[PDB]
């Protein structure tokens, strides 16, 4: 019974209830339909140049209203992919690369040859093209293992954007400054959409009023929906009262909602988000139980209870674990009921199997701690990957998705490279971040520890190696998105977002879920409190 420590929730009952004025909602919806159809006609414009078509698509995407034009934007990029017209200018070429690649079109990086000398490096003469540099920088983060051409693209555009930025006009200066701390591709969609609309496009002189208006309204309307869901989930979490009954666990439902919200923000994924938040919260309790409270013997009985997954096993568990255990089983029972109507209740097991896997490994992590076992990196990862809970959350995100078939879950059960990459990113990033705290304590059992021992290298060199694993992972994720995809892209995005969440949460190399204050707090306010002033 180790000392408390964990900071209490900052929010309180701030989101406990949200009465949505259907008056303001309908008006917003009414005008959005108009602006929507008006934006549609913009995309279907015939005599439009390449650069214009790309800038238009990029903007609608950054404004976060592109989910209205899945088909439209696709048929247009498809054509652009098949016509292969050379734009000759860096700005447009880089953007054509990124947008196509992000949509799975395997466009060749040969397009970037004309901007490199006979040596293969970028012409230093482009150092004055700010828009060209910015779009390249963005594009360098979508490269795969086959794109060795873009090898130096990131370092190139970076050093020169940092040099040029201080004298740029606004909002361009701000856009560049923000891109340097957060590229678009590895950032959370609503978070970047919130930043684009309010900090950039609104302050853009050449802004398209129909698009900005559309953007602000749509964003604000969806925020109402998110506020509702969070309310609903906040009430659910109070009825469990784990804040009083389990004072050792972290109270972070708003933070858990944020993740669910970064996995998907569309209204159609409302049922999905709710299920997902509940599970991220629940598994958070379990992580806290193994990590800071439970004892050797108790954890063992807990892991067995989870594997059996009955209810009779509850008696073998101490009183405090009986609450956790039952909560978990009742949660899945609700899921089974929620899906009963569509007849999709039979998929819930897939998530349960992953949870057992998560717990088994949690337990092993514990055993290693007690023995003081420092396994070789390979052995460490074979266990430390599932403890990230990403195979688990990844499977959970499919529950609430009405389109998810049994086949989609089977594909996911084989541990796809795309899923594997996402899990590794969380793993290495988390270990890099949480190293000193665990070792200043002592923990010869941590990720960086096994790495330094296994390879006989310094701490600096070990974290450096972990960074490359994350870079490798990202490249695998990008490759993963390329067509033909194993499953509908609709099922690849959740995984992609889970990795975006890691990048956003551990950006200052600090645990964002445990220490929200300086990392996650602003985002939550920007997405779930403050609306965009119309
Ligand atoms: Mg643990």
Swiss-Prot record:
Q: Which GO terms describe its cellular component?
A: cytoplasm
Please list the residues that bind (2E,6E)-farnesyl diphosphate: 250, 287, 291, 427, 430
Question: Where Mg(2+) 2 is bound, by residue?
Answer: 287, 291
EC number per UniProt: 4.2.3.61, 4.2.3.226, 4.2.3.227
**Known consequence of changing residue 393 to P?**
Catalyzes the conversion of (2E,6E)-farnesyl diphosphate to (+)-5-epi-aristolochene and triggers self-alkyation of D-430 leading to enzyme inactivation
Q: What induces it?
A: By fungal elicitor.
Q: What is known of its domains?
A: The Asp-Asp-Xaa-Xaa-Asp/Glu (DDXXD/E) motif is important for the catalytic activity, presumably through binding to Mg(2+).
Pfam families cross-referenced by the UniProt entry:
Terpene_synth, Terpene_synth_C
Report the activity regulation comment: Inhibited activity toward farnesyl diphosphate (FPP) by anilinogeranyl diphosphate (AGPP); AGPP undergoes a cyclization event leading to the formation of a novel macrocyclic paracyclophane alkaloid. Repressed by sesquilavandulyl diphosphate (SPP) via the induction of self-alkyation.
**What, per the annotation, is the impact of changing residue 390 to F?**
Catalyzes the conversion of (2E,6E)-farnesyl diphosphate to (+)-5-epi-aristolochene and triggers self-alkyation of D-430 and Y-506 leading to enzyme inactivation
Cofactors named for this entry: Mg(2+)
Put simply, this protein is called 5-epi-aristolochene synthase
List of residues binding Mg(2+) 1: 287, 291
Q: Name one GO molecular function term.
A: terpene synthase activity
Record: residues binding Mg(2+) 3: 430-431, 434, 438
The text of the family note is:
Belongs to the terpene synthase family.
The record's note on quaternary structure and interaction partners says: Monomer.
